[PDB]
Ligand binder design. Sequence first.
Ligand SMILES: C[N+](C)(C)CCOP(=O)(O)O
Ligand SMILES: C[N+](C)(C)CCOP(=O)(O)O
Ligand SMILES: C[N+](C)(C)CCOP(=O)(O)O
Ligand SMILES: C[N+](C)(C)CCOP(=O)(O)O
Ligand SMILES: C[N+](C)(C)CCOP(=O)(O)O
Ligand SMILES: C[N+](C)(C)CCOP(=O)(O)O
Ligand SMILES: C[N+](C)(C)CCOP(=O)(O)O
Ligand SMILES: C[N+](C)(C)CCOP(=O)(O)O
Ligand SMILES: [Ca+2]
Ligand SMILES: [Ca+2]
Ligand SMILES: [Ca+2]
Ligand SMILES: [Ca+2]
Ligand SMILES: [Ca+2]
Ligand SMILES: [Ca+2]
Ligand SMILES: [Ca+2]
Ligand SMILES: [Ca+2]
Ligand SMILES: [Ca+2]
Ligand SMILES: [Ca+2]
Ligand SMILES: [Ca+2]
Ligand SMILES: [Ca+2]
Ligand SMILES: [Ca+2]
Ligand SMILES: [Ca+2]
Ligand SMILES: [Ca+2]
Ligand SMILES: [Ca+2]
Lengths: 206, 206, 206, 206, 206, 206, 206, 206
Amino acid sequence: QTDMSRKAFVFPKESDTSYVSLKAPLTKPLKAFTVCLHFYTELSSTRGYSIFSYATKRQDNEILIFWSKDIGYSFTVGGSEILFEVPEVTVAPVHICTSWESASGIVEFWVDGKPRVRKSLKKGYTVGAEASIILGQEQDSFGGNFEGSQSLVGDIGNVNMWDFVLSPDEINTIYLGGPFSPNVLNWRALKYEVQGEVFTKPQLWP
Amino acid sequence: QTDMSRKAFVFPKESDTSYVSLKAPLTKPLKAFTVCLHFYTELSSTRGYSIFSYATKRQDNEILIFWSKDIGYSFTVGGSEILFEVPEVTVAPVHICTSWESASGIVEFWVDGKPRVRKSLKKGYTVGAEASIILGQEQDSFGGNFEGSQSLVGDIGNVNMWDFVLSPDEINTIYLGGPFSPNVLNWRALKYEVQGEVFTKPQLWP
Amino acid sequence: QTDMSRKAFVFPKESDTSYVSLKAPLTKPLKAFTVCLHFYTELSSTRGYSIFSYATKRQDNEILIFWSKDIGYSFTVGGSEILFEVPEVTVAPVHICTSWESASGIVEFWVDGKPRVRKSLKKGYTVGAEASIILGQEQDSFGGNFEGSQSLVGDIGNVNMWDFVLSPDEINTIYLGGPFSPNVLNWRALKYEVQGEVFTKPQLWP
Amino acid sequence: QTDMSRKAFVFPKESDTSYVSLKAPLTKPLKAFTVCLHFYTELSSTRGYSIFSYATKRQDNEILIFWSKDIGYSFTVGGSEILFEVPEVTVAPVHICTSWESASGIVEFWVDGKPRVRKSLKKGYTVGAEASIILGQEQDSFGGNFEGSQSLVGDIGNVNMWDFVLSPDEINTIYLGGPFSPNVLNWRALKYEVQGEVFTKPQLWP
Amino acid sequence: QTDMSRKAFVFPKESDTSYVSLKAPLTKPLKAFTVCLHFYTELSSTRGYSIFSYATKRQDNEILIFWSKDIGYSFTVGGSEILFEVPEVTVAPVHICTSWESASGIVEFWVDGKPRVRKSLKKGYTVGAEASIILGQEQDSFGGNFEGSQSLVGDIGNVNMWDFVLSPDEINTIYLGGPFSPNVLNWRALKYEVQGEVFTKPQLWP
Amino acid sequence: QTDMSRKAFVFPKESDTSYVSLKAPLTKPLKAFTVCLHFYTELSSTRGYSIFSYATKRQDNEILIFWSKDIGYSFTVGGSEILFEVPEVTVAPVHICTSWESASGIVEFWVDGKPRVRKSLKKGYTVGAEASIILGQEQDSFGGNFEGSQSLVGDIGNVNMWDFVLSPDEINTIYLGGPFSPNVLNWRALKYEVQGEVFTKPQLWP
Amino acid sequence: QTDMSRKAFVFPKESDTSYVSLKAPLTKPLKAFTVCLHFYTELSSTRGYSIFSYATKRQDNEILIFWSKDIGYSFTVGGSEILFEVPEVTVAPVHICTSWESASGIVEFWVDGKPRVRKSLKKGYTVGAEASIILGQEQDSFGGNFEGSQSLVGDIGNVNMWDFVLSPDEINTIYLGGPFSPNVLNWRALKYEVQGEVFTKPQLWP
Amino acid sequence: QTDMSRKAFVFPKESDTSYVSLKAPLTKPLKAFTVCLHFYTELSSTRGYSIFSYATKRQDNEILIFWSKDIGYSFTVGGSEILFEVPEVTVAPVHICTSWESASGIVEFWVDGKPRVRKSLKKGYTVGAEASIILGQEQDSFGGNFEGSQSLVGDIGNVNMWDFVLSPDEINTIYLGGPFSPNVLNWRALKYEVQGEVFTKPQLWP
Ligand SMILES: C[N+](C)(C)CCOP(=O)(O)O
Ligand SMILES: C[N+](C)(C)CCOP(=O)(O)O
Ligand SMILES: C[N+](C)(C)CCOP(=O)(O)O
Ligand SMILES: C[N+](C)(C)CCOP(=O)(O)O
Ligand SMILES: C[N+](C)(C)CCOP(=O)(O)O
Ligand SMILES: C[N+](C)(C)CCOP(=O)(O)O
Ligand SMILES: C[N+](C)(C)CCOP(=O)(O)O
Ligand SMILES: C[N+](C)(C)CCOP(=O)(O)O
Ligand SMILES: [Ca+2]
Ligand SMILES: [Ca+2]
Ligand SMILES: [Ca+2]
Ligand SMILES: [Ca+2]
Ligand SMILES: [Ca+2]
Ligand SMILES: [Ca+2]
Ligand SMILES: [Ca+2]
Ligand SMILES: [Ca+2]
Ligand SMILES: [Ca+2]
Ligand SMILES: [Ca+2]
Ligand SMILES: [Ca+2]
Ligand SMILES: [Ca+2]
Ligand SMILES: [Ca+2]
Ligand SMILES: [Ca+2]
Ligand SMILES: [Ca+2]
Ligand SMILES: [Ca+2]
């Protein structure tokens, strides 16, 4: 396990071969989750890119956080999709947290500490446990079939995941940088593989 | 009575059947009132929605707070109506307080602690005590005939009602949060009934 | 003498019958004055309205502070007008102070504590002491003949009048609500008479 | 109400006359509370001092937060006391939060975002709502009988009070300076009287 | 079961009455185990206290983790005891994991993710499955004869037990927080009885 | 001398007769200078106007600071000119400092304490000492031939001149109002003669 | 070595002759560098200009920091280019730090303390140490063939160079102006040669 | 004046003759001030020494900052003293800022960016304008009677003085070396006279 604190993955060119694969010894299917991360890219005005892609063999888009050009964030679970439209986009590092709960289907989406309106997605679904989590690319098969037009170029880091919906009070602590313990995917205790050109560099964001 | 402090009702899908009904111990009819609430919705740029509907068996719009698209707040009492123009809207939780006095008909409208100009509405009228108070829907009959196109989608909370006009100083403490005690309808001690797809969640707004 | 502190006159409808008359204890003709006030109205984009109207039996616009649509503050003395043009008007309570001095004709206009450029008007003129001072209406005779399309709608208050030019240091303490001692017309000890639909309410501006 | 944000009360002399009294127009007796405040003094090695004194007519020490020489924090409700021993102290501003709940009697003490062990005090008690809240002095009758040897010297500020136990996640947000809404006593909306040599100055702490 | 996630048991007073009893589904006898728990108490300087007490009808100290004053952690299995001396102790929540393997008698002790030196205890022994597990008290019969001077005061939580020796890589995830699945006793699927004055509260530690 | 501190000249009407003439106790020819003055006018969107016109018997624009409509500050020395283009003009008092040095021809221009980029003008020139210095008008002979279209309207004050280039730190104190000693032209010890409609009033700018 | 602290080179006219040649003591070829400098010019809306031109006998654009009109910053290493496109620019002094590392080819660009997204350029290349470093011109042979249309007009200063990538926290202190020790090119110990019309003046920026 | 930036006065031997006298352009008697300086000395364990000595012909200790052995900083105004005790001292360059305000008598003392607790001294006094400011010695008459046992040995510099209390966030910029413009005594525009064995050297500290 590597402590990536103060470090970010740098994807400095467009390619369909640069990715990092994050490992979770998760054994229970997810009835809820939260995923929080920082990314920095200047693509947002040019084209869409995958921020965070979770794939199971039944479903390449089992959790996907995606930027869609001139729309905003695409959040999708179980292949189904909801949009958080973002008309003004400004070139700065952006922190997001997103939570999903099966029992209500409520999606919470938070950007730089501000909540988006709660929306409904995939109520009653369950996210599979045997999953391939990939950064820098969008999976169209379990761990593969990357599309270069969907790769992230720039920085991603502080990638933390919980198998429960964080309350707003917790997320305020996360964004302010108070202490927290992610129970699914821990940036302080991260197991990952790097493929192609990806670099580990000092994070540009505070 | 239930203490709903720091909780909000979530209306995550459009429907004509998701609503909550609030019970007021209101025996005397109202010569004046104040109602304050937080709501959060994406709809303001898409369509109108009912924020707060108070109906009496003789009058379906006995008090109604309505967002009307490309206009702003429609505030109506006894079926008569006045508008508070809002040309531009930002995606954030919004707190409103509204008060009406029969003896003058003066309406105060407050948004995020800013007063709108006082206006005259239904001077000398008297609001009926026997009322069906509903969140999430627009009612065209006592407790029913909802229109799905008028439903609220998003969050509503801290719904407090006084049978008297709050002073500006009091309204400021409602907004900033200091101590107060509503006497018609009280979020700390609410009686409510929930129908359809409605959830109680931690409030997004501080 | 009524201490109107923290209170304001509310004109909640357009009419040509609602007004209040303020009884200056003046007997010397004014060689100079300052009038300062708070008002709040939505008309500024709809139509012109009288703010403060001072008339004498020879001259109905002996002092007039007037908002003229798409222009700004019309300020008249002795029936002659200068414009303090206002390109963008935004709906908030607005404090003004206006000062005139016969010995030079200089008009000072101050809006929310910022000076407009000094402009000359009516050098050598004299303002009659036997004056009907009216709020809420524009008057075209001594005490009447108001026009509804020139009436004020919304709030007016803190009307203070001095028979001398306040220096900028003093006008600053007026805007900040420091102590001051008006010697022509004192809001903290006002003689007034109300006619038609006018209400005394808590002031909305802090 | 005054927005005291970014400002602190300075008590720059030892005295029995300097105090500020904080008004909390509170309806129900408190079954629970949280009081958070930031303060700075060098007295800690010289003598004890009152930090926050809440009295009712029955009980001069109905809530008291007190530094006790060589012991540390003294926390008392209803005149019964517990100690949070502090063996080593530094001259720095210290932020504290203290929560009490009647239902369990559990006291949470938090210093600079670190929790002290939960302790039991006054289970089943009920703190009176009609209270005199004093800063700068310890009080022994409802509004008075101060002791100069128990006065605070230095700075006190960010005094916020809630009528409920904040969760740990909330308190983290407070200490990090996240957004929050105190519902009893609110630094952004403080109504207070100053007596004696007390000054409002920019806060020394961030 | 109960999901106790983010909750701790609070024992806010010294007594022999307050305890919780935890039920393992354990029917195989233990040839090895790991127990991990997070606790917080101020007793460490005042007196010894029981952290975790596993008893069988034949042996009341079948597994016991005990803090002994001015000595440190006492780990005993089958009545044989070894110590991990702790010369200096600071009041902060402490996480420990202990592992014992019969096939070698090796004891692993981990404090806040730092390993102690491996020690040998009870090689070849076998721990009985017919067990009573108690938190808050030390027990000397199968479920009682508690001693007030040995009771825990403060908080214990995240009590997880495995019938096998966790690897150091695993124990790092337990400390930092990543995914794991205990099979003897699972905090996220806990069966327990509360007895006496015990409260469930938000865990103070992240 | 007259100490004009806290006072400004008021030019309240457009004319070709209102001016003040300033006297320099100067006989050495200027190899360099700084001129600083604060002015306030609304003309800037209507037409150009002279800010500071310095003439010698050989050259009517020997130093001229001139606002030119839709361009900005014309600065001219010895009749040669450069422009400091200004794309957006607020109606507020504006403070300028301009400095010229013969040895390099560098012009510094500073507006409200922000420097313009340095530019080159009249390298190797020298300004005559026997000069007529006029505020309010743009002179085309040694003392006259004014033009109404070029007059200033509004206020001008704090006119200070040095026969050396002030450094940036020095200019910062001028803008902030630190101590300085103007050795060519001193507002605190000014010699001036007034002609026509010109008044001395309290400065509007703080 | 001249300590140029708080001084800037001024290039007040367009020319192909005004330049400053800076000499590094550098013997080992650069595997990485940081160049950061502070400059001020109005040309940005009018034409491109060279900010920092580093050449070697094989390569006239060995390092170039260039402003390209209506595009933004051009950063070139070894004659390959990447663009940090700037949508909008204003007349203010701009501080930039840039860094390049051979091993990864990552380029960092920082403007006024804001990082640009990290980009890739000339991975595996190496910059020659036998270098001519010229401010004021863009050079097309080792120390000459300056294109007048590429000259900088305005100010440049604080030119500091390191043979390594500064971390983000270092670069922050540079922009703050904390302690730093450039080891290739030190403004506080600058070896430089002026040619043509160039002046050294007090720096305009703080 | 001289720009003393990056340079310090060195008093490398004990004497009663080496001093520098600083000339304030101070026009007016001080109702408040701030003084900030860097000094470095090994005397702190051996004996007291004067850091900054301000005298008027009435008063030899009109402002004095003085290290007193085994105690800390004596700060005195008008000859009355307050102590900021410093129990442990470390041999490193020391930056202090001290502030006093007559209207409250509040003294602020800041060492290396840490505020001391605010204290009261000489409320209602006013510091005289005709003053001898001396570094290196303590003066007991207007310009003289130095005591060798009170001389500073070591370095003093960055001596900046304001006639107003700097805000705490200003003092951060002073300590950080952000921009500032002292208006009583400016190290970047110092007027001084050097007496005896005193040298100007590059400052040892950053
Ligand atoms: C853009 N998107 C997130 C809807 C789809 C991503 O690509 P794909 O998974 O449909 O192939
Ligand atoms: C207020 N409003 C007219 C916009 C909506 C009222 O809806 P309804 O009550 O007429 O169905
Ligand atoms: C609107 N106005 C103030 C410019 C002119 C008003 O003229 P009148 O209506 O008082 O006769
Ligand atoms: C409890 N205490 C003794 C530490 C503080 C209060 O003292 P007192 O209010 O009884 O005078
Ligand atoms: C001493 N000890 C606490 C480590 C073990 C014995 O305690 P006990 O079970 O005999 O009461
Ligand atoms: C060109 N100018 C408008 C800046 C100045 C004109 O001066 P003048 O030619 O009118 O005397
Ligand atoms: C074109 N450019 C801006 C990248 C480089 C300019 O220098 P050059 O290519 O003219 O020598
Ligand atoms: C307090 N002190 C010791 C620094 C000074 C006392 O008076 P003096 O030494 O300036 O004469
Ligand atoms: Ca896919
Ligand atoms: Ca794809
Ligand atoms: Ca309807
Ligand atoms: Ca209806
Ligand atoms: Ca009229
Ligand atoms: Ca009229
Ligand atoms: Ca008491
Ligand atoms: Ca007492
Ligand atoms: Ca026992
Ligand atoms: Ca036992
Ligand atoms: Ca002319
Ligand atoms: Ca001319
Ligand atoms: Ca080139
Ligand atoms: Ca070229
Ligand atoms: Ca002395
Ligand atoms: Ca002495």
